[PDB]
């Protein structure tokens, strides 16, 4: 009867942002005060709900979205943001109701000589809809001529890797992000915080 937030926050590896993970949270009780109490989090913003006094509300569903981005891009995990992350990788709706939790993970997700395992989408024909996930790897036609599955010239492979080196400035260091969405559907509410 206890919500499995440890599985998400204290997770060995995180997903690349373009292939962000989503964990369905239900049938459990959660202390968002115990979460807030962790001093690890460099970012803890909430939208439409007060962080404190969250253990009194009950939501039908709770989603825990998690991924890794550049430190400079944490600003983009917010309603109404623009940039490569919000436009092409992870998009929040304007009426987002939930919290955005982020923390520096240079100690875990940086490797000497570069960690290129973490990717992000750099090109897309259009912007993502809110909470849309695009793992396609079609070649992006930036020019007027077709590509036919080859990268050259105005044709680009759409994914690019972060160069996560431990020497990077804080703006180019890896950050782990957890986004909590609170769905209040007209169904049995199964996540509370007594």
């Amino acid at each position, epitope marked *: 009867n206890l919500c499995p937030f440890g599985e998400v926050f204290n997770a060995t590896r995180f997903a690349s942002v373009y292939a962000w993970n989503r964990k369905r949270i239900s049938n459990c009780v959660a202390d968002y005060s115990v979460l807030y109490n962790s001093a690890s989090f460099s970012t803890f913003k909430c939208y439409g709900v007060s962080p404190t006094k969250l253990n009194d509300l009950c939501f039908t569903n709770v989603y825990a979205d998690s991924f890794v981005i550049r430190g400079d891009e944490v600003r983009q995990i917010a309603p109404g943001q623009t940039g490569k992350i919000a436009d092409y990788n992870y998009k929040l709706p304007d009426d987002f109701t939930g919290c955005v939790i982020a923390w520096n993970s240079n100690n875990l997700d940086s490797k000497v000589g570069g960690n290129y395992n973490y990717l992000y989408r750099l090109f897309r024909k259009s912007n993502l809809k809110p909470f849309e996930r695009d793992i396609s790897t079609e070649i992006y036609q930036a*020019g*007027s*001529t*077709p*590509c036919n599955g*080859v990268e*050259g*010239f*105005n044709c680009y492979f759409p994914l690019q890797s972060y160069g996560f080196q431990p020497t990077n400035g804080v703006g180019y260091q890896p950050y782990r992000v957890v986004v909590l969405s609170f769905e209040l559907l007209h169904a049995p509410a199964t996540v509370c915080g007594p």
Partner: antibody
Amino acid sequence: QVQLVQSGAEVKKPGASVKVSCKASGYTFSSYGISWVRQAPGQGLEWMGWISPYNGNTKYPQKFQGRVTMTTDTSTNTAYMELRSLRSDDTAVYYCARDLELGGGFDYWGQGTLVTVSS
Amino acid sequence: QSALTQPASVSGSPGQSITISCTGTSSDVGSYNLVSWYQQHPDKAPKFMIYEGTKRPSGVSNRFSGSKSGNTASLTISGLQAEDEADYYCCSYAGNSTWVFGGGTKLTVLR
């Protein structure tokens, strides 16, 4: 019909620069690329680089990296190529050609421009 | 970024069929079906003849065929005629936004 008209043959002293013009007509300028290919007398063809009149993107092979500059006037429908630090094995005929890019072909060629590097 | 190796010269009797070889590495001819062929008559700009290895732009005779096997592309001229005397160049994508030509082959018609 498709047409590419280049500037006239000229002499250049060693170390000078030359700009070859290439005027396109009969097709949408930005719907294709422009590659430049040169040919030393009695020698084979050498790809010199590409430019997109669409976005201005360019690419040059390492050999000519630094010494060649390709530009595109989208209003005049004209591609220019400029080569500095001219040496005597730069004496060649210089072709501009409509480029299918990853379509895989140089569609139509200009008549060429014979650049002679000589004092 | 190294030149493609074609035979310096090819000859054939009229009405015969000849083939021009074009060899690269795995990184160019082997990787992409992006081989094109060009025909250059003396004192003239080259002419686009073959693309994607085996296709013909509308206007090229049907006796120009394209072949490919491993790291070698091949141009085949059938029903050989006098107008086919020219220099033939092959071209391949080499990765990294780079095109790369062949050494060229001089076609001689025997008579």
